[PDB]
Amino acid sequence: SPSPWDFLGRVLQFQHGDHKRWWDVLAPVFGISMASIGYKLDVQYRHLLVLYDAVIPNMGPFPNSNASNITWTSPFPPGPLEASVNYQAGESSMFRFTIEPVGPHAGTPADPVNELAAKQLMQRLGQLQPGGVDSTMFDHFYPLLCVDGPEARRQWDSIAHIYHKCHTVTALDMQRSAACTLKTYFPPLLRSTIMNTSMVDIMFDAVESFRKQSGLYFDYTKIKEFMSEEKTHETMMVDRSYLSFDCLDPAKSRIKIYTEAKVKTLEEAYSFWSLGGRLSGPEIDYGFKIVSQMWDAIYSKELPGGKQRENNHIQINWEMSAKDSSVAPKLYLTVIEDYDAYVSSAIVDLFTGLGWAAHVQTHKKIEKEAYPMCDANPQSTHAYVWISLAYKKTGPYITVYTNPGASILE
Amino acid sequence: SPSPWDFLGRVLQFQHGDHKRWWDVLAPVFGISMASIGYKLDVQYRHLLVLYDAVIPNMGPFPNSNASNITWTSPFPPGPLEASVNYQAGESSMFRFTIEPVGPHAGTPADPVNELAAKQLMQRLGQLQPGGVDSTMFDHFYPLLCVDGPEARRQWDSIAHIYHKCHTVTALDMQRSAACTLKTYFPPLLRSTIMNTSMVDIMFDAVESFRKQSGLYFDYTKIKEFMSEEKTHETMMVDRSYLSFDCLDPAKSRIKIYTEAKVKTLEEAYSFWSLGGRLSGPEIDYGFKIVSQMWDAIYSKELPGGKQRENNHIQINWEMSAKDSSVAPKLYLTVIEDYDAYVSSAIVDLFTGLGWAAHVQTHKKIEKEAYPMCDANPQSTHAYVWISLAYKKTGPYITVYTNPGASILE
Amino acid sequence: SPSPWDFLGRVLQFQHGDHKRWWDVLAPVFGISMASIGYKLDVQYRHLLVLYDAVIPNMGPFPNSNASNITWTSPFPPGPLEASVNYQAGESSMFRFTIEPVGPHAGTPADPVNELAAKQLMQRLGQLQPGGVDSTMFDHFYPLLCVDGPEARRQWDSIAHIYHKCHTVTALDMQRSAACTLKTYFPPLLRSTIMNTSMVDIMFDAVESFRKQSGLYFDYTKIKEFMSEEKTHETMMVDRSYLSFDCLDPAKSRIKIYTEAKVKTLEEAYSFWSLGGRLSGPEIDYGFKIVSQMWDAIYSKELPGGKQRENNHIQINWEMSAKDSSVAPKLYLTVIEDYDAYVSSAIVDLFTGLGWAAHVQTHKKIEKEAYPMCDANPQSTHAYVWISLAYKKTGPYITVYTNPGASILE
Amino acid sequence: SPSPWDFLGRVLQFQHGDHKRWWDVLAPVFGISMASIGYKLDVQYRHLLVLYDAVIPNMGPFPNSNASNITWTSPFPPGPLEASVNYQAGESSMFRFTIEPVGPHAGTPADPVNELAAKQLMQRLGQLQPGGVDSTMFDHFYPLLCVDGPEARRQWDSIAHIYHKCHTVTALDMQRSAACTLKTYFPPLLRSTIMNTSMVDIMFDAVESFRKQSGLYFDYTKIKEFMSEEKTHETMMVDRSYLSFDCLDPAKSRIKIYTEAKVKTLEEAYSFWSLGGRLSGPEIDYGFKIVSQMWDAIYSKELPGGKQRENNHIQINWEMSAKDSSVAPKLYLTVIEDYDAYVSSAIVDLFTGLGWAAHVQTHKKIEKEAYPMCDANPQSTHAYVWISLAYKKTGPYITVYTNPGASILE
């Protein structure tokens, strides 16, 4: 019995060779992950056809040997920023993946700001599931945080120095229902650089305007307070922050404020995890015990090439609920330049301690089948990229983010 | 939840508009049938993608208003000759469909004999399922019964008078396993017209040569005897005969000899059903009781336009087993020019008498969902085309053949 | 020797059947026009491939029998708003065509404002000719006059009453050089309806801001004066006005202000042609003599169905030069609901009087070859749509606009 | 002004990525050659679209790094066997190219004999030019010399030892008229290996049968006599012989018998060039003086890697005219494993001696623009493959055959 991705690659007609190459790289990874976590074959077919129809045509050029064709500059290797599996209690596992929608002529004089690809992906996905994409939050936040083509082209001298001219990132939560929840991330770096306004101010002003004109509670007081301090700016790269929302009914959606911090201790990490004691409770302590566990387990081990850990790179989101005044943190450990073996051992020890044996086996199956380089090459550095840790009232919430184009780098 | 054909038509990229139009006509029919008989969604996706990849590109031009584009002449309306559901005991139901593979330029000076389309379909299907298409029987019977392009073009003056220059028909048994069994039919009319040899002789000589060079028992004595008589030729249109084989291991395949007969009584029908008393047993009597039942039930009712039944059009196959000397008949009643309502009532009465209530509901569901014209238009004549009746040792074996392009004629 | 459109339709691979159908309708028309006016075969191939690559994929659904698939409402029949041939002295003839870029899912919940198609066309055309599309004027005028998707979706209640939610129209001057000059038209009806500001004010404020931030002279004083009067509004449908610019270096581009007027006399027509005596000179008088000639020649003749001419429908542009303070008028007579025979006779008499015999034969050749319905059907009403008249210092400037999808309406 | 291949690659939609890659390799070469020899842009577009539509889809997989995807074995690198420019007197230059039509699944269990691709190419080309492909000669010679799929699959044990299971090669003479003359080559190695008959016998029996059933004179007496001798077989690899015909009206076509010979002297070369003194006259002597000139000029120079010339590899055709009893030779020197610089110097010296300065500059332009590796790499071995020499009554006839996929090997 062939697998959905094999059979589909056999039958599917592709509009461009780059789509076929992206397919050959990614469809096995995504399918193996969905299968290992237990998605039904109906659902695998539907999600792989979403990937074929809506995502891959908006993924951009497929890298050649010298990457002479990647005209859209990025610190991230071409392709999805990540494919992720989130593990919770009750053997709950969801597949997700993030893409910075890149057009095929982005970075060229015709699309110097990559303005259409996210919109094309939105449109195609909405056609594939009418009623699955609500553009209310997108329509409010796009003018404020995002920069259109015209504005970016008039104000080019202001932003040409920026290496990654990203303005919209799109993630798909590929649900076990064959439903794909779209999530939009806006890095407002271009907005700030053109308006010479601060990230904090534009983001939270957009949030407050949405509050006003929607009647929904998105409490950002604590986040703004913490993020405007100077002790935070000492470690924070606030220019690396972004705003995320689920593209749904604003009453069922969220707002999330992301920022990057290069820290050295778990005190500086608790600083971001609790916004300076402003957030407290049992969930905070449980989540930070998980954080310290994975910190000691991953960042204690040595790096490749005997390189020293100058500091530890973390990202952080604070999630604001449209129903309540409840800021909840999610801490991302960056592990892209660590040993995939040590990362996997840390994940396995964590799951084992939490009683998640099924998740251990799912993670190992995904590693073995979809990321063979982890065992073939003992000095593997390309598969795993991020570990997200959170503690909801449901329990722990651990997302493992991997590079599904590691094949390309090995 | 969308259906596989809806979602696929949304996502699938088609190489030609005619493929898209054929899809819009046929995918709902085929999917509704597969669903009603209980095929899993995995299997529906796989079979609809076979239809999209291998079949529809070899179905030919999609008819316009005036059919100015159907350059390949045929008595059958463009598209599949039939989509069929076979019903047996134990609530067993299989979906099948028959296509005369027509190229897009067949009947034009470039492909005046339609030589490649069957081969293209064979190749594509074999790629989609390596090991599912055995070409042994095809390779033996193609030179004998079929005519290649070169031979047909040198000997054109001999066959240009033929209206339907068909040489290969291909049917797919779309199994509940998502496996597609390919069956090949060869009408040797062109072979006979060029060699001015008799159909009987070329067909049974090919059968005997396969016997010799394979060591398999295909007893054609009784069939040859019956079909060479003159009383048979009085009713038989032997020039309408053809040879069918399943494209599998010859030891697991069959050979089937088909012929057309326009008869007037059930005595002349028993003549073909038993080869003149040569075939006998309980299966023969049971099957012919079913035949008489459906005869009285369908051909007694009046025709549209008050037209009189000059005679009754039947086809007949005799199936020879590669294991035994066991000729088994299958009798086809032609109902294309009858009332679909009376045909459906006959089918329902038959199933009810046999104790097949699930099959009654499956047939009615397929009629309602995939052939709405049967209820919308009380004078419906386009959906149902054939009723095949047989009695295997397993029990009755009744196949309902419908025109899945009835949409086009209504 | 086949023609470029025949051979290309034979070889070209189309992404969608609608593109193939649009091709079958339009490529003969466009090719016949380009050929009749004398474009080299190299140029015909290049322009037809532009049409195949950039235009037709952004033309929208191809109308079926009942037009059940045209979800984007418009008073204009689906397809190009016009294909035009402009005739000047010296046997100068240029081919042009106008398209309202419509996406394939425009008017549906996924693209309710048709936001991407014009941008996709711009991008594709810029890729096909890097340096041929300057977005400076587009980037300045798009935020002001045009409405993005987000704004249109937040402010939907304000504009849902509008039947034609058009915001960007794109014309291509297909030059004899195989260069395609892109021209962008913005109808600011949505901008005005959302901001409840007047068309005059938003348009001329955008023009003045471009003046300021570009240092180019675009004198709109006379146009604003005339268009804000009340006597003008008595006849003018100012809500039908739009702003056009050539997508080039603003110093080599133009600005043009278009408005519709349903008038009854040539006094009311001179009112628009001279902005109320504000524009004067020999060019004005010559051009208006041509206007009166064609008025008497076309609108004197009777209509089909014996319907009476309630009034005469004209459009008008005033062209402002980036170099000088020189407003120049161009008057459009609407002839869509006249007899194509009388329109053609008027055109021929005009050309003959002007000494344009080559143009007479070019026009008759285009009528005969690309619009046969004009002779086949004596009561032809679908081919010709507009006659534009102007008198530049070079001489007369007469553009004949035709519906290149008349095939679809006959 | 872009070139036809650049613009077309920009606009053309490709059915498969391999077609796009083959295009990127070959369209510049073919276009540069056609342009350098003076084909009009109309003609370049038409021929490149033939290449895009009919040829490249039947060229087969595009080789990856390790050629893991070339499942169809061949001594020749994947792609065209050659692109050629023929030079004659009067500054006459014609572009040609040869392809062994390979399907995309040839060499796999579904197409183990590559049976359809030549037929698909024939059909597509005939559609692109109805009346340009006459299948009379093809229809007569295909059953005799070529092996169909069924025969090759029944008789597999007889031919599986053959490395190159080629049966049909197709060349296109891309005329300055934008007309493409198709030429078919049949290597009957499979026919002989299955029938265990000699190449000579099957080929000349097919020729004699065509004579009989056509009334055309194809004198093969001298060729048969020479090729059946034993002294010839001492040097001749008769199993490497093939039969060529132009796919036209047999009265305007030719028959050509090709064979390979690895010789050591020009006496052994004259043996093939004159069939052992059987062919004589001034043309023979002139052509062989040209042959000796190029022999001394090319095979005297040393090889790369200091490897010794064991012997010199030549091919030879004898052309029989459907009008006369006139066998004419054409001698092919193999130069694939020589220095491209010495080959080019020999060609240039030859042309110069013949007074062909325009041809010298055309050849140098093609080398510089389409084969830059010849100057970039002084040790170039991949561009030039063959030099054909003949002396018709018109004068010399020198064809330079190059590998248009040298890019892939450098």
Ligand SMILES: CC(C)[C@@H]1NC(=O)[C@H](Cc2c[nH]cn2)NC1=O
């Ligand atoms: C790409 C963009 C500039 C911005 N920056 C980031 O670092 C993260 C990337 C990421 C994916 N999964 C975990 N982290 N997301 C973003 O949207």
Ligand SMILES: CC(C)[C@@H]1NC(=O)[C@H](Cc2c[nH]cn2)NC1=O
């Ligand atoms: C089409 C061909 C000439 C030949 N003739 C026929 O009548 C039947 C058609 C058929 C399909 N299902 C039931 N009957 N089959 C054949 O192969």
Ligand SMILES: CC(C)[C@@H]1NC(=O)[C@H](Cc2c[nH]cn2)NC1=O
């Ligand atoms: C379509 C749009 C609303 C707007 N309105 C019009 O009437 C004209 C149409 C037109 C095409 N060629 C001559 N006249 N142009 C426009 O841009």
Ligand SMILES: CC(C)[C@@H]1NC(=O)[C@H](Cc2c[nH]cn2)NC1=O
């Ligand atoms: C490929 C086939 C087996 C056979 N063998 C050959 O050697 C030549 C190849 C060739 C191309 N141009 C000059 N020589 N042609 C053929 O048809």
Ligand SMILES: CC(C)=CCSP(=O)(O)OP(=O)(O)O
């Ligand atoms: C996805 C990129 C753009 C940032 C990392 S965050 P993630 O959101 O994918 O995880 P969650 O939705 O918060 O569950």
Ligand SMILES: CC(C)=CCSP(=O)(O)OP(=O)(O)O
């Ligand atoms: C299918 C056409 C060509 C003839 C009617 S016969 P059928 O074979 O489809 O039915 P069976 O295989 O005999 O079961």
Ligand SMILES: CC(C)=CCSP(=O)(O)OP(=O)(O)O
């Ligand atoms: C083209 C539509 C949108 C309006 C009619 S005006 P036209 O501009 O095509 O003619 P000109 O450029 O003014 O020459």
Ligand SMILES: CC(C)=CCSP(=O)(O)OP(=O)(O)O
């Ligand atoms: C072309 C391959 C198959 C063999 C070399 S011969 P060529 O025929 O291309 O040259 P001519 O037609 O003889 O002019």
